[PDB]
Design a protein around this ligand. Sequence first.
Ligand code: MG
Ligand code: MG
Ligand code: MG
Ligand code: MG
Lengths: 245, 245
Amino acid sequence: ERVLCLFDVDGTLTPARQKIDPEVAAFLQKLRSRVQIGVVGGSDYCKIAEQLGDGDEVIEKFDYVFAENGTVQYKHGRLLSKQTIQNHLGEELLQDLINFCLSYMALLRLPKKRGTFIEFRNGMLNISPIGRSCTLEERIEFSELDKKEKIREKFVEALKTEFAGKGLKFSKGGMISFDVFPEGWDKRYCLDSLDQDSFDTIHFFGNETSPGGNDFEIFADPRTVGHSVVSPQDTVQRCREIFFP
Amino acid sequence: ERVLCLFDVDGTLTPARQKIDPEVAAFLQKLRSRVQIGVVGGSDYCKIAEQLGDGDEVIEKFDYVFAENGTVQYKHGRLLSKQTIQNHLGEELLQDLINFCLSYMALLRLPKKRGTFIEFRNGMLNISPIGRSCTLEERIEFSELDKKEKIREKFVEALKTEFAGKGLKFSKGGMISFDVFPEGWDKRYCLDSLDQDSFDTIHFFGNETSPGGNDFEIFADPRTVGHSVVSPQDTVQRCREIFFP
Ligand SMILES: [Mg+2]
Ligand SMILES: [Mg+2]
Ligand SMILES: [Mg+2]
Ligand SMILES: [Mg+2]
């Protein structure tokens, strides 16, 4: 009777990294007459906020806004505090990680390099072996280089081996970067808080629910009814079938 | 007859890193009835904009806004393009620099580390051996550590030696960070563009005009009438004496 629908963002509600279609948006508000609705994305809040309305409207349009996998949470218009990756990991392991990344990147000799190789967020370190500080022509340029030299991939292989058994996970962040987060700080993190809000059912929709994907763990988790979608139209489709039959 | 007064920001017009006193601000507008006025700061535009009014008002209140030593320039309400440190330095030297900084920082084992060790701006690399991504308690904490271990200072000594004769300059950025810029991209950079605006006199005011300080080179440059000030009140004082005697 208390139902929440929880959506991944990229590919599930919106074209990847882009604004939502006003028609999907319009539907989500309709869905809201029956159930509460929320989103969970890997990206920071501002990025998510941008894709889903104007300014900070997203927190008004959605009952739940879980950014950075849920390490950052908005609930019914208001911010709830965030745990810090350093509080969770502690300083020593976090610095072993950081120094390893610095020492590995120092040895990479590329065509170009830019800035902000290691960005410290709430629920992850975002690592970019070229530089988060590049333009569009440069994003595409490194994107090509990464494919050819497997830069991120080899870096991740080396990181996983070095920190084997120490509770870190790595997943790519699309172009030029990868994330490093504590084990358990994938999308499932948001479920722990949601456990306290007395939902009878939590429907999750995601487009990467296959093994490997960033939606897998939350989709497979026994706390959710899992749904696999291919597009924003597939998502609306499914919600119609279940909630408006 | 065409006169410009050009002010450094921190310590010259405003308490360091802080909002301008409405009384100084009020005076600067009065000064503007006689002469054009401008500012030049080491910081980025947003930082400068914040200290000097609300939002982007600074470009309306000042005839010239030279941020990042002049590599970024506003002139009479509008932005003029910026040269890029990489266009000036080229990719190879810039990456030698970057990799050297990465390799040096990887070997620093500190109490803590955070993120954004190398921030790529327009007219410099800002290097922070702890992490630009820290809070106030942490800024103060590293600030203490830096004093005791001479972290930035030893890093700079090593950088200057390594890149001896290669045209790079280093100056500290107050707490936790230092800047790396091409030789000539201190405050004097803004004078090259100002040369094209047909001023009969350019008065410069700065509080670090002693050798070593970030105001020295522009103060000593034969293109300006140089003035040494100790406070925002000293600045207003001097402008009264010269322009309102
Ligand atoms: Mg997705
Ligand atoms: Mg499930
Ligand atoms: Mg000053
Ligand atoms: Mg002079």
